Design a protein around this ligand. Sequence first.
Ligand SMILES: Nc1nc2c(ncn2[C@@H]2O[C@H](COP(=O)(O)OP(=O)(O)O)[C@@H](O)[C@H]2O)c(=O)[nH]1
Lengths: 166, 91, 91
Amino acid sequence: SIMKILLIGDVGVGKSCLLVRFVEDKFNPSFITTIGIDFKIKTVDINVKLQLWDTAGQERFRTITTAYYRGAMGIILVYDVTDERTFTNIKQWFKTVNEHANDEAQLLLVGNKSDMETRVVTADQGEALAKELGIPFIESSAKNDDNVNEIFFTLAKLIQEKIDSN
Amino acid sequence: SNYNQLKEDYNTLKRELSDRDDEVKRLREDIAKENELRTKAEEEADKLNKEVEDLTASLFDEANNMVADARKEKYAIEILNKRLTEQLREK
Amino acid sequence: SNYNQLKEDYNTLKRELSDRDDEVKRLREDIAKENELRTKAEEEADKLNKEVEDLTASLFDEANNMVADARKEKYAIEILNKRLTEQLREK
Ligand SMILES: Nc1nc2c(ncn2[C@@H]2O[C@H](COP(=O)(O)OP(=O)(O)O)[C@@H](O)[C@H]2O)c(=O)[nH]1
């Protein structure tokens, strides 16, 4: 009973480190540095099998990486709170999303590295971005395991809720 | 030259015209063929574009799984090293 | 009368021709236009399989590279493993 999820944002944000932590498999490898993609499958109980893309977003496989946008049932738009320009680079991602994103697929914001505290963004400054865009908000630590399993659990709910509207 | 220049030019023109009218009936069918190629190529374009995630997923599945199995089998023998580095140790 | 009839039959076909020269010229644009589009649909499908061939070599070279490492170190341990069981028998 599958669902397709994908992550989105700059290098250095902490998207490897989030996926690594969400899916607790140490035996799995990391290509994200060598080739520039990774792809994982975590089954979760809601009452459903996830499938998750991650990307260094470089040019070399841009044609394929794009193919993930088209079939992706949820996108996670991710930013660093220790980094200010990552917090601003978000809308150029958002239009980038909906030009490619299949309209009815659902999105979510993410404010990461709450952990590390030379934090530029507040939580309310984060919903200041989230508000306009019509999309749910969460912030997490990838290091300390804060709200990580929620990020994914909340997103998948919204999607199961969406299926049965029609 | 003058009436034969005529009678003859008209005859030349007559065959220039039938050449030209044919090449028109022929370019029209050349286009419809070239159309069929175009549409079919844009179908391929599209088809692949869709099929690709799934295709690529399948490579990753296998790639990860290959390394997982290899990694577990190593690990399992560190566990063996451990257990007998310590079967000796206390003893 | 016939000389005149000829004169203007010439004139008629003269344009009947001129018309085809136009309808050819345009039809040759229209195909080059159609072939433009079909060139693009081939152009990208190549681009794509180029990337997919590129991934498939790379990912798979990379996995085997990592699988070598696993095995490499697994064997190194297996060596120490024997060395230790050979001391378990002495005891
Ligand atoms: N302090 C802190 N560092 C993090 C956190 N998440 C990731 N990082 C670090 O940020 C750096 C880049 O993260 P990475 O996951 O590679 O980012 P990606 O390129 O978007 O996947 C690495 O050095 C991570 O260890 C976090 O929650 N707190």
